[PDB]
């Protein structure tokens, strides 16, 4: 665990394209969307949605959930080699999948909906959850070992009407799985004190802005609160799903999140989907109840719109932003690696960066200044004894399929 700890404008990062080993075929009017990436213990999980036509309004063609091994492909660069792919029969009904690795399998928790994205149709969505277990090293003659699908029926939600997985990847603790999740709570039941919304140095802010922006709109029936979905494998019997709400310290609207293992401890990231646009990440103080020691990070934010653009800090009623997580690679110096979008109000210009709380040590663009890019997911790991990070980046091809790309970036030990 040696990395360069000195800032430099030199380009010491050499990103490698590693999408060659994944089944992301390119065609005329095929769009690949809703991606997922997880990397754990030399294995990985991946998913996307193949659409025909519009990337946002198009018809669903195929959803894939696949796992496999991350291996040195032959030139000391890691790459993802799929071993086990599952395909659901109705690809338009599967939403918000989240993968967690545990003892030889990847557990992907998905939402089932026939009304579209539950976030954008909260009241019409009838809560329906399921789980698909994929073995990272398949066996012949094994029955349900390679693939197992289970519908979830025992759900403990607490005070929330509905719960749902909400993020790319989760973490295991012993034999209990934890998934990034969100609880739908009606506004009427939401306990929040206006005096707590920090407008002190915000001349144009109003006390009500925090409470209003906990839903996708001010008059939304529900507010969204992020949290965890808990599944204890040692219990057995009929599976029980348990929602754990996140603590109210630095509370923002429920947004896609990630809880992950780094150097032996759980770390959390939450997408900034409203007015608090500085990156939200940090070590988990307690898993249950869920409390995060958010970093006071002053250098990384996310693109928004005109009401809460990049670097906005003062409370407004806005539902804007992108998911751009970061991965802690050094807890002693609290250094992280991730891709951010270098644009104030549009999703473009992706830049892979290694940074502390108040300083970007080094970084490198992943495309041209103008290239469109939305979601990015970064997971880091050891390959032999070398530190690598793998970054999934949604990228738009001006010429052509608009699809995710995969980059491997080696983190230098020296400067």
């Amino acid at each position: 665990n040696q990395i360069c700890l000195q800032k430099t404008t030199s380009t010491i990062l050499k990103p490698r394209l590693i999408s060659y080993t994944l089944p992301i075929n390119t065609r005329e009017g095929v769009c690949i969307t809703d991606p997922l990436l997880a990397v754990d213990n030399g294995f990985f999980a991946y998913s996307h949605l193949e659409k025909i036509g519009s990337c946002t309004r198009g018809i669903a063609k195929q959803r894939i959930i696949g796992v496999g091994e991350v291996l040195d492909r032959g030139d000391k660069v890691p790459s993802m080699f799929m071993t086990n792919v599952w395909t659901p029969p109705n690809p338009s009904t599967i939403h918000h999948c989240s993968s967690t690795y545990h003892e030889d399998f990847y557990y992907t928790l998905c939402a089932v909906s026939h009304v579209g994205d539950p976030i954008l149709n909260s009241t019409s969505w009838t809560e329906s959850l399921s789980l698909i277990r994929l073995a990272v090293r398949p066996k012949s003659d094994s029955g349900d070992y390679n693939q197992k699908y289970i519908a979830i029926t025992k759900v403990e939600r607490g005070k929330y009407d509905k719960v749902m997985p909400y993020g790319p990847s989760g973490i295991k603790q012993g034999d209990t799985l934890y998934f990034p999740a969100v609880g739908f709570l009606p506004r009427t039941e939401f306990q929040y004190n206006d005096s707590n919304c920090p407008i002190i140095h915000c001349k144009y802010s109003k006390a009500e802005n925090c409470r209003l922006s906990m839903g996708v709109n001010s008059k939304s029936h529900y507010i969204l609160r992020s949290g965890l979905l808990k599944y204890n494998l040692s219990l057995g019997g009929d599976i029980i799903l348990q929602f754990i709400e996140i603590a109210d310290n630095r509370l923002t609207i429920g947004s896609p999140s990630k809880i992950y293992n780094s150097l032996g401890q759980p770390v959390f990231y939450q997408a900034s989907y409203s007015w608090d646009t500085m990156i939200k990440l940090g070590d988990v103080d307690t898993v249950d109840p869920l409390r995060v020691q958010w970093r006071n990070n002053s250098v990384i934010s996310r693109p928004g719109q005109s009401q809460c653009p990049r670097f906005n800090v003062c409370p407004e009623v806005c539902w804007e932003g992108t998911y751009n997580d970061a991965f802690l690679i050094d807890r002693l110096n609290w250094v992280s690696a991730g891709v951010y979008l270098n644009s104030n109000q549009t999703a473009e210009n992706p830049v892979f960066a290694v940074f502390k709380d108040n300083e970007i040590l080094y970084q490198v663009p992943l495309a041209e200044d103008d290239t469109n890019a939305q979601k990015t997911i970064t997971d880091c790991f050891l390959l032999e004894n070398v530190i690598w990070c793998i970054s999934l980046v949604e990228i738009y091809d001006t010429g052509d399929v608009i699809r995710p790309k995969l980059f491997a970036v080696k983190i230098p030990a020296q400067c």
Partner: antibody
Amino acid sequence: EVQLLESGGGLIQPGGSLRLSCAASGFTFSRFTMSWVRQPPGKGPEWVSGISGSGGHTYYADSVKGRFTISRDNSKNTLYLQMNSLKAEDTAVYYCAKDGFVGQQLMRRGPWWFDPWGQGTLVTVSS
Amino acid sequence: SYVLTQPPSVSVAPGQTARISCGGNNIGNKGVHWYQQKPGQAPVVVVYDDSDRPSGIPERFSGSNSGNTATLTISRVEAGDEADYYCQVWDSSSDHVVFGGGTKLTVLG
């Protein structure tokens, strides 16, 4: 229906100051980004400045930064433009313009477009 | 600072189908909007976000964006359609709204 009604234009010498107003109705004023777009005679429009619904963020074009001020009184549903140290090239028709997007999206392909425009107010900087 | 380039003049006859161009470097990396300006009036949006159509705008006005040129094609062109057409984007390298120079659409009665 949405109406935007500009006023305050007139004749002024170079180096003077004028204040434009825009009266807005038909929508919740404080939830939309508002902008001033000017059109010099015989030329196309030019974006001058914009302001977020609360007024927390103000945006300016380089040609205008440091001389004009965009502000907004939400209790009066009024958008303002204080133009100072006016130059001859500022001569144009100045439009109130409302951001046309309504809906819930996390990101927008085009985060700034205009619907509708006011009918405009004419500013003549001349000696 | 980002530059949008338009042809200054375009002519058709009544009911003929016209095509107006908005050129910018890698303009497919930007969302394009189109405005129509009849003489003595304020501009009016006819296309937003490359191809989306605002309600109240006839379907014959269509927009598209690809590569280095966006195009606003109008079919069944009519004497009412004689106006100036401007394209418009957001430049995130300058945080500026940028307009094109405009295209005079002439239909000869």
